[PDB]
Amino acid sequence: RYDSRTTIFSPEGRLYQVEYAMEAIGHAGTCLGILANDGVLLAAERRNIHKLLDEVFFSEKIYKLNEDMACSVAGITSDANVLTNELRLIAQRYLLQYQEPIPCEQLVTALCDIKQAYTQFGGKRPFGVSLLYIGWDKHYGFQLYQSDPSGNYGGWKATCIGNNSAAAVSMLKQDYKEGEMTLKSALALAIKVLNKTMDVSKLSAEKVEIATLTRENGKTVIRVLKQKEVEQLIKKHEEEEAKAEREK
Amino acid sequence: YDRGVNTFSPEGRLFQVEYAIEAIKLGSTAIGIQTSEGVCLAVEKRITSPLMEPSSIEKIVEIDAHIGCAMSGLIADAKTLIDKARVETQNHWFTYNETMTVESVTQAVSNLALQFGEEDSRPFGVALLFGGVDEKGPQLFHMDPSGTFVQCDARAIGSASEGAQSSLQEVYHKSMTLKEAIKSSLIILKQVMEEKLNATNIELATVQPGQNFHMFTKEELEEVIKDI
Amino acid sequence: TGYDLSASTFSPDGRVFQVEYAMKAVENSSTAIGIRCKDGVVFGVEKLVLSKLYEEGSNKRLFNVDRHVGMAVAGLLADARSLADIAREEASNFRSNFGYNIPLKHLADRVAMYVHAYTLYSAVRPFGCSFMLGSYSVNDGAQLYMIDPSGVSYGYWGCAIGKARQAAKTEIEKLQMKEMTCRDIVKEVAKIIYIVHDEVKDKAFELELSWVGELTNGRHEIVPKDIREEAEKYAKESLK
Amino acid sequence: GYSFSLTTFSPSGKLVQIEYALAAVAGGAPSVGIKAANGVVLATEKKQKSILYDERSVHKVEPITKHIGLVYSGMGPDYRVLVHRARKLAQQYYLVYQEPIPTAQLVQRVASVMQEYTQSGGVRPFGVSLLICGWNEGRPYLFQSDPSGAYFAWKATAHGKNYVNGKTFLEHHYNEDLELEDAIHTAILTLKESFEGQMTEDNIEVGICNEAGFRRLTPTEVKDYLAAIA
Amino acid sequence: SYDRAITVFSPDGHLFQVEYAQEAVKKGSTAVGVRGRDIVVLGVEKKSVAKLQDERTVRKICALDDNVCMAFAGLTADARIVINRARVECQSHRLTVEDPVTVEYITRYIASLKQRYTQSNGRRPFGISALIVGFDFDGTPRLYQTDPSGTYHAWKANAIGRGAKSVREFLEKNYTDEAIETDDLTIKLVIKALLEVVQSGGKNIELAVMRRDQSLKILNPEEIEKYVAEIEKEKEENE
Amino acid sequence: NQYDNDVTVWSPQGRIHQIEYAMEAVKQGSATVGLKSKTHAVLVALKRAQSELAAHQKKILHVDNHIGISIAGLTADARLLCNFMRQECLDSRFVFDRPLPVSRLVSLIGSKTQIPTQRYGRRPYGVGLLIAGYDDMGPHIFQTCPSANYFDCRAMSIGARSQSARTYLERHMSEFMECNLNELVKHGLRALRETLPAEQDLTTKNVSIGIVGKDLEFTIYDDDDVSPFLEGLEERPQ
Amino acid sequence: DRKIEFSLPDLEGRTHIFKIHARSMSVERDIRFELLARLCPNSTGAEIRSVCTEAGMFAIRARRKIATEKDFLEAVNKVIKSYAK
Amino acid sequence: SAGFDRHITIFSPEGRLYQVEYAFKAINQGGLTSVAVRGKDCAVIVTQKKVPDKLLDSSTVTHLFKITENIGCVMTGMTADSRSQVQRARYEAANWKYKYGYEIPVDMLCKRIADISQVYTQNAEMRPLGCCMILIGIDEEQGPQVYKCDPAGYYCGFKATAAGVKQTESTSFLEKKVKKKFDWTFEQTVETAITCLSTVLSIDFKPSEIEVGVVTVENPKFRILTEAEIDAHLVALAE
Amino acid sequence: LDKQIKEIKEVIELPVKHPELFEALGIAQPKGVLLYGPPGTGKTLLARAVAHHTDCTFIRVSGSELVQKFIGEGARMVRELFVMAREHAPSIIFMDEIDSVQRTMLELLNQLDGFEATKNIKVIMATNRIDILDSALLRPGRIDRKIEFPPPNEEARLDILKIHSRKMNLTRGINLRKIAELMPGASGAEVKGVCTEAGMYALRERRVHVTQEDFEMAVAKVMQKDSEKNMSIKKLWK
Numbered sequence A: 001r002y003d004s005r006t007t008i009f010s011p012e013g014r015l016y017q018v019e020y021a022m023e024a025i026g027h028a029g030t031c032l033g034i035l036a037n038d039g040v041l042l043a044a045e046r047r048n049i050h051k052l053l054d055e056v057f058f059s060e061k062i063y064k065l066n067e068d069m070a071c072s073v074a075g076i077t078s079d080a081n082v083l084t085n086e087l088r089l090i091a092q093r094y095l096l097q098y099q100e101p102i103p104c105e106q107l108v109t110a111l112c113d114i115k116q117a118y119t120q121f122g123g124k125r126p127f128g129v130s131l132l133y134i135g136w137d138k139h140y141g142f143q144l145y146q147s148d149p150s151g152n153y154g155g156w157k158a159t160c161i162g163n164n165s166a167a168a169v170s171m172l173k174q175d176y177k178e179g180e181m182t183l184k185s186a187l188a189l190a191i192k193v194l195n196k197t198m199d200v201s202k203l204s205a206e207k208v209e210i211a212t213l214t215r216e217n218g219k220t221v222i223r224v225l226k227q228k229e230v231e232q233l234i235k236k237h238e239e240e241e242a243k244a245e246r247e248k
Numbered sequence B: 001y002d003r004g005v006n007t008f009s010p011e012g013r014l015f016q017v018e019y020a021i022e023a024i025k026l027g028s029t030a031i032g033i034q035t036s037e038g039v040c041l042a043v044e045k046r047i048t049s050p051l052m053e054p055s056s057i058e059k060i061v062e063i064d065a066h067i068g069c070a071m072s073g074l075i076a077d078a079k080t081l082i083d084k085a086r087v088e089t090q091n092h093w094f095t096y097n098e099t100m101t102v103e104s105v106t107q108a109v110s111n112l113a114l115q116f117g118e119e120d121s122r123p124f125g126v127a128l129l130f131g132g133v134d135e136k137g138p139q140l141f142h143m144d145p146s147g148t149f150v151q152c153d154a155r156a157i158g159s160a161s162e163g164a165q166s167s168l169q170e171v172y173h174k175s176m177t178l179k180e181a182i183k184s185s186l187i188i189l190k191q192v193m194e195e196k197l198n199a200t201n202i203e204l205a206t207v208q209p210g211q212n213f214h215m216f217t218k219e220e221l222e223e224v225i226k227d228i
Numbered sequence C: 001t002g003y004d005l006s007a008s009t010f011s012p013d014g015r016v017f018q019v020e021y022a023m024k025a026v027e028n029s030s031t032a033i034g035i036r037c038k039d040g041v042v043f044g045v046e047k048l049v050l051s052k053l054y055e056e057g058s059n060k061r062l063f064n065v066d067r068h069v070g071m072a073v074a075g076l077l078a079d080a081r082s083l084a085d086i087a088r089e090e091a092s093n094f095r096s097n098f099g100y101n102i103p104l105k106h107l108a109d110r111v112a113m114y115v116h117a118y119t120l121y122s123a124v125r126p127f128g129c130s131f132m133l134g135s136y137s138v139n140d141g142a143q144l145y146m147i148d149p150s151g152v153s154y155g156y157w158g159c160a161i162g163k164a165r166q167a168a169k170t171e172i173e174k175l176q177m178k179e180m181t182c183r184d185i186v187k188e189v190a191k192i193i194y195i196v197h198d199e200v201k202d203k204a205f206e207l208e209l210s211w212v213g214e215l216t217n218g219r220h221e222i223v224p225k226d227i228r229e230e231a232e233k234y235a236k237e238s239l240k
Numbered sequence D: 001g002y003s004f005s006l007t008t009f010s011p012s013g014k015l016v017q018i019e020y021a022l023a024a025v026a027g028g029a030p031s032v033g034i035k036a037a038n039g040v041v042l043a044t045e046k047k048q049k050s051i052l053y054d055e056r057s058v059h060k061v062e063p064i065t066k067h068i069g070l071v072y073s074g075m076g077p078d079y080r081v082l083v084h085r086a087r088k089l090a091q092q093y094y095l096v097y098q099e100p101i102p103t104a105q106l107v108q109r110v111a112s113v114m115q116e117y118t119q120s121g122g123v124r125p126f127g128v129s130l131l132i133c134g135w136n137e138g139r140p141y142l143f144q145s146d147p148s149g150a151y152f153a154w155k156a157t158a159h160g161k162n163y164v165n166g167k168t169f170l171e172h173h174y175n176e177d178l179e180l181e182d183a184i185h186t187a188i189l190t191l192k193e194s195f196e197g198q199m200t201e202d203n204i205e206v207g208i209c210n211e212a213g214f215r216r217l218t219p220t221e222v223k224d225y226l227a228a229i230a
Numbered sequence E: 001s002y003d004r005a006i007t008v009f010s011p012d013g014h015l016f017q018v019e020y021a022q023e024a025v026k027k028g029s030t031a032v033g034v035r036g037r038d039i040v041v042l043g044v045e046k047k048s049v050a051k052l053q054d055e056r057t058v059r060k061i062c063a064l065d066d067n068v069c070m071a072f073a074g075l076t077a078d079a080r081i082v083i084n085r086a087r088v089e090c091q092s093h094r095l096t097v098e099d100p101v102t103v104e105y106i107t108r109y110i111a112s113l114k115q116r117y118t119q120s121n122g123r124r125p126f127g128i129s130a131l132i133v134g135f136d137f138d139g140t141p142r143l144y145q146t147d148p149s150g151t152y153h154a155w156k157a158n159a160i161g162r163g164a165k166s167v168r169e170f171l172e173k174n175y176t177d178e179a180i181e182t183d184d185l186t187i188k189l190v191i192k193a194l195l196e197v198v199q200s201g202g203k204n205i206e207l208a209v210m211r212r213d214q215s216l217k218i219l220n221p222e223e224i225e226k227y228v229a230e231i232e233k234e235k236e237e238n239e
Numbered sequence F: 001n002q003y004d005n006d007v008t009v010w011s012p013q014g015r016i017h018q019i020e021y022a023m024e025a026v027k028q029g030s031a032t033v034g035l036k037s038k039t040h041a042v043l044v045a046l047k048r049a050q051s052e053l054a055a056h057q058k059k060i061l062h063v064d065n066h067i068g069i070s071i072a073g074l075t076a077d078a079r080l081l082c083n084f085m086r087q088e089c090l091d092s093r094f095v096f097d098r099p100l101p102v103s104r105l106v107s108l109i110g111s112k113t114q115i116p117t118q119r120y121g122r123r124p125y126g127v128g129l130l131i132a133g134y135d136d137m138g139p140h141i142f143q144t145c146p147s148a149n150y151f152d153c154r155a156m157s158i159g160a161r162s163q164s165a166r167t168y169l170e171r172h173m174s175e176f177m178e179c180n181l182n183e184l185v186k187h188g189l190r191a192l193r194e195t196l197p198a199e200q201d202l203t204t205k206n207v208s209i210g211i212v213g214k215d216l217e218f219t220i221y222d223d224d225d226v227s228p229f230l231e232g233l234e235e236r237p238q
Numbered sequence G: 001d002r003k004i005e006f007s008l009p010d011l012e013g014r015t016h017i018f019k020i021h022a023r024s025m026s027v028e029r030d031i032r033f034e035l036l037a038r039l040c041p042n043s044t045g046a047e048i049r050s051v052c053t054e055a056g057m058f059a060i061r062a063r064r065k066i067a068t069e070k071d072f073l074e075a076v077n078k079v080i081k082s083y084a085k
Numbered sequence H: 001s002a003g004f005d006r007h008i009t010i011f012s013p014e015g016r017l018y019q020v021e022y023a024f025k026a027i028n029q030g031g032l033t034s035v036a037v038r039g040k041d042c043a044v045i046v047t048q049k050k051v052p053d054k055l056l057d058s059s060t061v062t063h064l065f066k067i068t069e070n071i072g073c074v075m076t077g078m079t080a081d082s083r084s085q086v087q088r089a090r091y092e093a094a095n096w097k098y099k100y101g102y103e104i105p106v107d108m109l110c111k112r113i114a115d116i117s118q119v120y121t122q123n124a125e126m127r128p129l130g131c132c133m134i135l136i137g138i139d140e141e142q143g144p145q146v147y148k149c150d151p152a153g154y155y156c157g158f159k160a161t162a163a164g165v166k167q168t169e170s171t172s173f174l175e176k177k178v179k180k181k182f183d184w185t186f187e188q189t190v191e192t193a194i195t196c197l198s199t200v201l202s203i204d205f206k207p208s209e210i211e212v213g214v215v216t217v218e219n220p221k222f223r224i225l226t227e228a229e230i231d232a233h234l235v236a237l238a239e
Numbered sequence I: 001l002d003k004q005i006k007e008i009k010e011v012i013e014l015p016v017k018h019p020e021l022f023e024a025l026g027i028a029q030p031k032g033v034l035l036y037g038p039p040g041t042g043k044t045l046l047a048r049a050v051a052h053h054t055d056c057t058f059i060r061v062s063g064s065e066l067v068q069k070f071i072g073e074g075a076r077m078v079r080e081l082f083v084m085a086r087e088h089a090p091s092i093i094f095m096d097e098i099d100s101v102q103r104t105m106l107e108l109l110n111q112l113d114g115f116e117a118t119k120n121i122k123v124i125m126a127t128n129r130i131d132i133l134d135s136a137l138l139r140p141g142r143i144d145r146k147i148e149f150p151p152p153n154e155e156a157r158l159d160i161l162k163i164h165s166r167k168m169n170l171t172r173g174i175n176l177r178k179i180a181e182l183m184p185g186a187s188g189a190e191v192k193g194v195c196t197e198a199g200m201y202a203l204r205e206r207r208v209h210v211t212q213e214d215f216e217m218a219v220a221k222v223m224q225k226d227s228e229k230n231m232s233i234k235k236l237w238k
């Protein structure tokens, strides 16, 4: 039994606690970052579809902290909340000492260093939260990144985290698009990937939360989709699959 | 009865630092001899890779020009003790404007050695040999993770230290000249460690009362090579 | 067993066995008695001769640092010295702040609270001695106190701690402490010391006495058996 | 086993210790909280091991502002400590932002508080789950905070022992267009379903948040509303 | 006694926990660096950035100062925090001390950092090792490596476990006491080591070469492929 | 056994076996001898060797010109208490400029050693000590134990094989009180010889002496002082 | 009744045991057993037996129907240093 | 149940207060019993002062304490912890009067003590106080109150209450008594408490066996009844 | 479920029906099978069925006896099952719930590596949950595929109903299609359960009931057992 504490090493040289954390996000959600151009989006599904849950904040998976930053969340809710507030504080400090927007990579690496520090020291537990962010800055513009409890940040053209991640990444390899891959094509791909990852047919709009950032508004804007536009996207996917059935 | 240093064993011993003594065994052997002509220290290398820089192993290191030092143990705690020794000697000079006598170095180093379980950690798995030529003439001392220190006419510490120590006891006496003591240490090392001795697999250091500088030996081992 | 290892670990039923172990360890120590007369308090302690390496008066168990308090122990001597130090510190604190003598009730209360405080935290253990507290105050009355390693203290007309507990309690019961003066109390104390297992299984023992009263201006002094040897011979009056 | 320490994960990626704290939440006295079009209702039940108590000497429903209602289901002492720290946090926010605590701000801050006890083995998380109702921007709202250190919103909710039947009742009975008095009636009905014995003013206390302010029902109001429940 | 604690000795004196740190490094990928006639050259391999993942975020190499760069193998989080610590240390020492920094001081600093974070309970040691390159040994090049046990040494060429077992043996068989003739033969020997490495396809292999008088230089994939083809041809006429 | 954690664990038997193990660690030390007259205090030590090319471990440490100590145990704690007593002697010389009486210093060491016995996080100071000191109140020969207890002994001996010595000092205590310094050191040497094995004998190399007096400051009497006192030692008959 | 203590052989003991085992083996009667023994560290008597057997193995691998002193040396390095690695 | 009860901070799989119940069991070991009863304008406390021996002075073994000149207190538990918590209550009342100026009612005092007890329950550094709390006090123009606080930190007011060993029996007696609305005056209240206790212990008490305290609207000064007053009350019940 | 039948047949039924193919193409015959899916849901129902169609001896082993947990006989009991199976060749060995100690795991791996396929003797070991151990077992010479058991689909659950629907009677219009869609994500045995719980609902009226309405509440009491804490689990894990 060499899995008790985060600060010990096992005779095969692995960290069972951090692996347990990865498996903890293994059933967290199905949040994804879409491969897109002219605009970048996040797609999230909520396992809280219910007749009485209120969703008062109009969003429980997405959280926006900038005029050019936003994040999608899948993991332990308390850890997720403290991490998002910590990101807000880091952005505030960087804007105060630089009077300049933070680079996305510097911010995410700072968070990953904090997470690694939280894992390294004794009596402390890894944040079992993996969350996806997007941002536009003066270093690399359109940017999409992923972070994990161990303190590692993953840069991806497209990625998905949470449950059934294998199917999502496999199809994103298969249904991959490059370059000209507009935001609307990203909406179609996100719709398809969530329909396959979920067991549902005719994916209901209230079971998905999607936000995006657009740069034709080059002063920069971030939008969170409402129910009607998502339902229209669902109808478009349904007519696409109906046409595919007509292709026989 | 092994959880920590701050627990007494049924016999009164400590089965936590007695293993720190056992850690000396896994370290390389080193030879130290005190002679009226001078103090010499010998260190075994067992070349690990030709790509290594041979001097990169700090098992022979100087804390001041009037004194010598040698190591047998984990090189990390070794470097910690080495740095602590240099710091105490330099501060002693800074305050008193004189050389720190080797006995005071050995005593003052040991206070850091006495921090495993008495402040507010773990004993450093390193055993050291000091050699100094000062106001009390030529001196050679030995100190171990338990914190005890002893003035030594000769000493061998590390792996295979027991046989080398026994043979040295059979040959050595406290009235030799330095050169024959070095020769005895060299033949003992040649016997024990690998093969025919050379600068690659053995290191030598020696300081003298009339030469309170440069214990180190750099390719003057060639005389040893042609002799022994 | 199991819920035993720490002073802060409650038993599944009842109290912590750590405290019980402390008081039973007190039970096996050298005996100490203390009896108070109308205006004064007298203590009695038996001490073991160690070997002849002993120095006829060394490592004694009678300690007194207070302008009106005498104090003797029955337990492990190291914790006895430590508790004497805590009592001295508390007495000095009271004398410095309040400016006048502490009531023995309040002093024993604070000392016993500290003792019990050494039982609350898991990093610290209960003490290994039980001691008695003796004093007189001209202002309000005459007092005697008994404090255990469990942090529990009471006042007694007379009490006895050591490997004589119940027998020495009975020897106290035969007395008439309400009206007797401390001069007879010394004789009865020494005799009681000698009757209750002086050297039955033990080789031999040493006796020392303590005596604080109004007659001695409230202050404590060791009654000298170097003079008059009257309680000493009174004890030998009881051998047959 | 893995519940011995809170600082470690299970191989299943679960915190066993946090779960058992939520079992103490199930051991708590059931509380029913639902929102109406004109306000929110928080209802709870009490019983006494003997009639010797002063059943009005304490209150289970507590406010955090003049317009906030708050009810729990757990052990009393941890609830009271959390209430004290929540009131102090609301006062600090009032000092800082010169405004009373918003419901969302209050719930996130108190959940972060209840997360503060979810680290290190020397401390233990509250065995208390909170129901919070309040008025904000002219509309009624309600949420819930649990020992996990998180929060979720709820148009209709209840928790405690025998809570699943309360969930079923709320699913089959609650609609989003209910009225405040009918909301109180639904709350007392589902509390009666949730707990056995007659429900009287000695047994239930209810707090209702009105947009102007929040008040707790008086014993005579409890007697009146509990009587003639349909 | 057993290995369940950081500060506990084994009954024969071993510290199994730091050995487990070294082994956790040993599972980490290939990392081999050499110092040539004047230049120091390194080669990053086994990145295997799969399609959707971008190679920019991989950080195959990070430069601490203009005369020292590092990448580490093992855990990327520990590698990153040690990178930040070394960067801050070197920059602050050069800015504050009356005289500037040399690679020996930062070597001592990182060795001390590993020894420190290894020294007490409640504080996990780094699971990373790295091979240090310095330019200012009085202008001469020099090469170190670092280890989780807080251990460092100087080499003419060094490798770590996954790359060690094959590549390092290949070097000790091949390494000429004559320093590789010019940076050309330095890169040739690095490419030969990469040939001794697992896959050598060039899909993820990248190299950074530092001349010990010039600052660090980064090699493009096209030049790496050209060098690999040149080495393959050289093996081809070697028949 | 469950009951061998830190000294915080009270045994059901009314003991704390860590403390008993500390007493055994005292018995782990080599033989020591301590004895006084009405005018002098002398402690005699047996310096354990290591080899024919290494020096014997010293046993007598200097704390102050009027108080001397002799150690038996793990030398680390021995030196730590030695530094402690040095510091307290210096503070006593600093505050009122008065040589510190033995009894008060020994009480301070008792309190200091007792604090670990109650508190987790530090093993009690596990070394046996012999103390020789003279002050304006009287001559003193003392011993202390890791149980944070101390004993004033007319004549005392701790370590392995010490019981034969203890018998010697117990038999002869009818003699020392007014014996001269030479007679007292001869008595100490005779006491040391009792603990000796049949195959080993006293010499300057392994014998250490320490003397303090009312008109003689405490100094450590090593080989040079051992050389004259060796004469007059009782023989080894059968 | 009686406790009998067994210790690792000294140089004399090592020479004697080498004489004992090598006597039955096919060797040249010219070997310096004392050199082998003093070359031998605190190695147990079982180590002496195993070293003699390994010297015989070294001889067998060359099909030499006599062992050599060289075989004894190489066996000493093999066994002693291979464990002492 | 077993195993997870060894520490106060560890929740058992059922999620139960096992160490709290162990503190209660530590309470019940001391063979004692107390009761507090509320009247129309009076509050009455009485406890069994079971003197174990005569050589002690009866003044030194009291279990009724005055924490405020108008507030009463009564113990059940080990002597040391009871003394500690009465000292803490006195300190808390004094600090409240120092900070706020005006009165600290029994409600605030018991609530504060229960809160602090919950704090020691929450942190594993120190063992919870294994004794119970009962108080009496007069309130501003409303009437007397009886409050009970326990090691668990539970805190509430009481028309009648009991503590000690004899919990269920005493509470049943009080419950049988209180069902009828009547003029529960001072004499009737104290008589009811005394007879409750005399049946639950089932002994014809001598006066030294008990201690009686009372606070009333007409006499807000908390009083501890003398032995002669105890005899007067006993002969009042003698009818 | 249909995909399960084909791959198990290709890996069990096929090595039974045509051994000439594997010798003609010079391969070592496939040796092991491992099943992923929710517990049961055709897991055992498949293994029992394939043995009937091959007429080989079926061995049933629960996960419970696998985990004796007091070093019961795990060392040799595995062999005793194996040797008897060889005695009754051709035979099929089945174990279930491997997730329900390490030493006998190594024992099984060695036997899995060692026994000969010369007797058409194969191992089908089944699991319910995704475990870290399970991914380690997929090794050369031990297991060759990853058959998955998904939750039955709408029409799939309808077929499950129809399997047990032969015995049950019906009204003048029982549309099982509409009944089928009321349990999204329900497992297989639960679809039997709704038929099972429709069972004593016939006893709720003590006559032939099997009514369309019956299943509507025969759904009701079935789902809650597949439920309850799952509602809290959201508020628990979040």
Ligand SMILES: Nc1ncnc2c1ncn2[C@@H]1O[C@H](COP(=O)(O)OP(=O)(O)O)[C@@H](O)[C@H]1O
Pocket: I001, I039, I040, I041, I042, I043, I044, I045, I046, I096, I152, I160, I163, I188, I189, I192
């Ligand atoms: N796809 C299915 N079709 C019909 N019945 C099924 C199906 N899956 C499971 N069952 C039911 O499950 C029972 C067989 O046990 P099963 O669930 O297959 O494995 P286990 O014995 O491990 O639970 C049968 O009684 C059968 O009615």
